[PDB]
Assembly symmetry: C2
Homo-oligomer: 115 residues x 2
């Protein structure tokens, strides 16, 4: 359960969640949730510059950037859902691969605790 300081050590029970309508990321605190939501757009830009210096490709790396920012922002674990079901780290990466072929990118917003 949520600690006196507002922390969820078990991400599965967290009330702090963000979604892009396909994927849902769970956070251990409101501080981490807001850091992700407030910085992912800028991180996508920084991520692309770094990737492009390594290799030029026709791919949309936005989702991979989002997964990477989540891992960097959330310090108490990784917990995600894909299309409403609990997804493993690898399953989220598979989704990011398939998404690389599509031109448009889905944005993220805070949602209420799911079922």
């Amino acid at each position: 359960p949520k600690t006196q300081r507002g922390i969820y050590h078990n991400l599965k029970e967290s009330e702090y969640v963000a979604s892009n309508t396909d994927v849902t990321f769970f956070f251990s605190s409101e501080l981490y949730l807001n850091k992700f939501l407030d910085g992912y757009q800028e991180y996508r830009k920084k991520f692309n510059k770094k990737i492009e210096r390594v290799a030029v490709t026709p791919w949309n790396m936005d989702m991979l950037a989002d997964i990477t920012f989540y891992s960097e922002v959330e310090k108490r674990g990784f917990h995600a859902w894909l299309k409403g079901d609990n997804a493993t780290w690898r399953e989220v990466h598979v989704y990011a691969l398939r998404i690389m072929t599509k031109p448009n990118t889905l944005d993220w917003s805070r949602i209420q605790k799911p079922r």
Copy 2:
């Protein structure tokens, strides 16, 4: 035709070719072909380290590294075949995107001019 300096300005006519059995790259000179063959394994290691500094993924970036190294070595163009047929830059990247999910990596070797 091959110039007096051993150069092929039209890559499709080149006798300097390398293949990994799925993809074939054409070179404008023996110097470039050998530069590719002599350094692609080492470039893969370098490439992978650069990518990982940007993002950790479960993918095999070898083919992407190979495409990137070929683009760096061959100074007179890009000309490739995919499964025995002419393949555009985009089609080769599509192949690299797919092969990313396989742990094994095909090596490259010089071959006799095909077809």
